[PDB]
Design a protein around this ligand. Structure first.
Ligand SMILES: Nc1nc2c(ncn2[C@@H]2O[C@H](COP(=O)(O)OP(=O)(O)O)[C@@H](O)[C@H]2O)c(=O)[nH]1
Ligand SMILES: *CCS(=O)(=O)NC1CCN(C(=O)CNc2cc(Cl)c(Cl)cc2CC)CC1
Ligand SMILES: [Mg+2]
Length: 160
């Protein structure tokens, strides 16, 4: 059976755990690792997921090396978390020693009325990186399946 090792990275508090809990366990209430079989485009896929901010080492650096795809998560009401994205992407590229690593940019907390990061800013950044941008809410489930499944599709594209 096909397995995908996914890593969800981003500043603390952006909702990495909340997004992964919503995907895997289907709930939100206002575990660092998760493992579940799902079906994506008719392919049975075992998802092995790690949520990490990088400040919590061994399992982490290992996780970055084996990770096949990465969600780069910021929150739309956290400018610093958006500013941090470049650091996370550069870190992954260095560890993977590759310019072609499957990634998706995720702007979480889209349900909130407080916004300090413009959708255009995020779209522009993702365009520069050549990766998808998806607006999500772990609370309402907006974009959650789309974010993770898009990443799995990026991994497939890489492997093809
Ligand atoms: N309103 C809202 N709150 C969220 C969302 N995602 C996460 N949260 C809340 O933001 C806080 C931090 O979320 P958490 O999953 O622990 O962030 P992490 O440090 O990135 O894993 C918690 O109080 C969550 O309930 C979201 O999409 N919308
Ligand atoms: C994901 C974050 S964590 O698990 O690594 N823990 C963080 C929680 C948020 N935080 C804080 O500093 C918030 N609090 C405070 C801590 C301290 Cl030491 C002081 Cl002096 C004051 C506050 C409140 C402002 C970072 C770690
Ligand atoms: Mg967490």
């Amino acid at each position: 059976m096909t397995e995908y090792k996914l890593v969800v990275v981003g500043a603390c508090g952006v909702g990495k755990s909340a997004l992964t809990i919503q995907l895997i366990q289907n709930h939100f209430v206002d575990e660092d690792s998760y493992r579940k079989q799902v079906v994506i485009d008719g392919e049975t896929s075992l998802l092995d997921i790690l949520d990490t901010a990088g400040q919590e080492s061994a399992m982490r650096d290992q996780y970055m090396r084996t990770g096949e795809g990465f969600l780069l998560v910021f929150a739309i009401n956290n400018t610093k978390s958006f500013e941090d994205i470049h650091h996370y992407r550069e870190q992954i590229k260095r560890v993977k020693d590759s310019e072609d690593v499957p990634m998706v940019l995720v702007g979480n907390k889209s349900d909130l009325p407080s916004r300090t990061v413009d959708t255009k800013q995020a779209q522009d950044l993702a365009r520069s990186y050549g990766i998808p941008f998806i607006e999500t809410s772990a609370k309402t489930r907006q974009g959650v399946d789309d974010a993770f499944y898009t990443l799995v599709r990026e991994i497939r594209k890489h492997k093809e």
